[PDB]
Amino acid sequence: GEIAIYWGQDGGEGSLRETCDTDDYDIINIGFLTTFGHSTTPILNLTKHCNPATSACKFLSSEISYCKSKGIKVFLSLGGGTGNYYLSSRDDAASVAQYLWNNFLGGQSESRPLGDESLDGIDFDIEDGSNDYYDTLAEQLWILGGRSGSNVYLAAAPACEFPDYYLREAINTSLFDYVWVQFYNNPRCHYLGNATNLLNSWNNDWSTILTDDLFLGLPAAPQAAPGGGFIEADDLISEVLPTIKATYDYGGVMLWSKYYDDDYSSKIKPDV
C-alpha cells in the first residue's frame, strides 16, 4: 500500500523537499488551483509557501524533480474547499485540460507557474460549484496523455457519501487511476463510535467504482477535520486496515494534510 498526502495549504508545513524526505509518502497532491474554467485565468494558491501569480514559485521545479527522483508521484489538485471554479461547457473542459497540460504537465506555456518539471497528473478535489463536465475534463486529459506518450495520472477525492454529487460523473468514466474517498466531515459514513458505517460504505458502495487504486482518505489529526472522522492510529491498524486490504484494488491511505501529520503516517505506514 501507498500513502498520499496533500501539501500546499499551510506555509509552515515544511517545504515540498522536506515533505518528500520524510520517506512516508508515495504521492503528493499539491493544492490548490482555486479558480479555473468559464474563461477565467486560472489561479493557483499555495498559501504562504510562494506566490504563483508573481512568478515566485518556479523554484519548486527542482523540488518536484527531487521528489520524482525518489519514485514519488506529484499531482496538481483542482478545487478545494474555497474557490471560484466550475466548467461551463464541453469546450471549456477541453480548454482547461489544455491549460493544465501546457502549464503543469508535459506541455509548454508562456510561463509555467512551478517551472519546467512536469507533474505526474491531476487530482480532482471538487467540493463546490457545478458538477458538470468534469467527466469531459478527465477524458480530455486522458487524450492529452495519449497524444504525447506521457503518463497523466487522474485522481479523484470524493466525500464518502455515495454517490458523490460533484464527482460521480467523473468517476463513472472508469478513467481514474486513483480515488481517495474522504471518510471525514460526514458523520453519516465516517468513523464514529466504530467503523461499521465506514466499512459498509467502502464494501458496498465504493467497491463498485472502476478505479485501479482505491484509497481510504483520512484526517492526519483531529484538528485536520473538526467535523469528525479522525481514527486513532492503533484503532486504524486493528479495526480498519485489515478489512479494507481484502478489497482487490485497495491502494492505501490518503491524508489531509501535511500540516497536521506530525507522526500519524509514521505510526501507520508499516501497516498500510
Ligand X SMILES: *[C@@H]1O[C@H](CO)[C@@H](O[C@@H]2O[C@H](CO)[C@@H](O[C@@H]3O[C@H](CO)[C@@H](O)[C@H](O[C@H]4O[C@H](CO)[C@@H](O)[C@H](O)[C@@H]4O)[C@@H]3O[C@@H]3OC[C@@H](O)[C@H](O)[C@H]3O)[C@H](O)[C@H]2NC(C)=O)[C@H](O[C@@H]2O[C@@H](C)[C@@H](O)[C@@H](O)[C@@H]2O)[C@H]1NC(C)=O
Ligand Y SMILES: *[C@@H]1O[C@H](CO)[C@@H](O[C@@H]2O[C@H](CO)[C@@H](O)[C@H](O)[C@H]2NC(C)=O)[C@H](O[C@@H]2O[C@@H](C)[C@@H](O)[C@@H](O)[C@@H]2O)[C@H]1NC(C)=O
Residues that bind ligand X (CB under 6 A): 193-194, 196
Residues 226-255 that bind Ca ion (CB under 5 A): 235
Binders of ligand Y among 43-72, rule CB under 6 A? 45, 47
Binding mask 6-45 for ligand Y (x = CB under 6 A): ---------------------------------------x
User: For the chain, what's the residue count?
Assistant: 272
Q: What is the total count of residues that contact ligand Y (CB under 6 A)?
A: 6
Q: Does 116 bind Ca ion (CB under 5 A)?
A: yes
Contact partner, 168, from Ca ion, ligand Y, ligand X, none, Cβ < 5-8 Å per class: ligand Y
The CB density around residue 196, as the number of other CB atoms within 10 Å, is 11
Q: Grid coordinates representing 177? A: 487511476
CA angle (211, 16, 6) in 5-degree steps: 35
Does the annotation count 161 as an active-site position?
Answer: no
Distances (CA, A) of 154 to 32, 174, 196: 15, 10, 29
Output helix, strand, coil percentages for the chain, rounded to the nearest 5.
Answer: 30, 20, 45
DSSP 134-150: HHHHHHHHHHHHHHHT-
Among positions 55, 82, 148, 204, the unique one binding ligand Y when judged by CB under 6 A: 82
Catalytic residue among 13, 63, 117, 127: 127
- Which of 42, 36, 11, 83 lies closest to 257 in space, CA to CA? 11
Stretch that binds Ca ion, among 49-57, 110-118, 164-172, 255-263 (CB under 5 A): 110-118
List C-alpha distances in Å: 250 to 19, 182, 206.
24, 14, 11
Ranges within 172-201 binding ligand Y (CB under 6 A):
172
Q: Which residue, 12 or 193, has its beta carbon nearer to ligand X?
A: 193
Judged by beta carbon, residue 24 or residue 139, the one nearer ligand Y is 139
Minimum gap (Å) between residue 224 Cβ and ligand X: 22
Q: What is the DSSP letter of 68?
A: H
Show which residues are catalytic.
127
Instruction: Provide the binding-site residues for Ca ion, judged by CB under 5 A.
Output: 116, 235
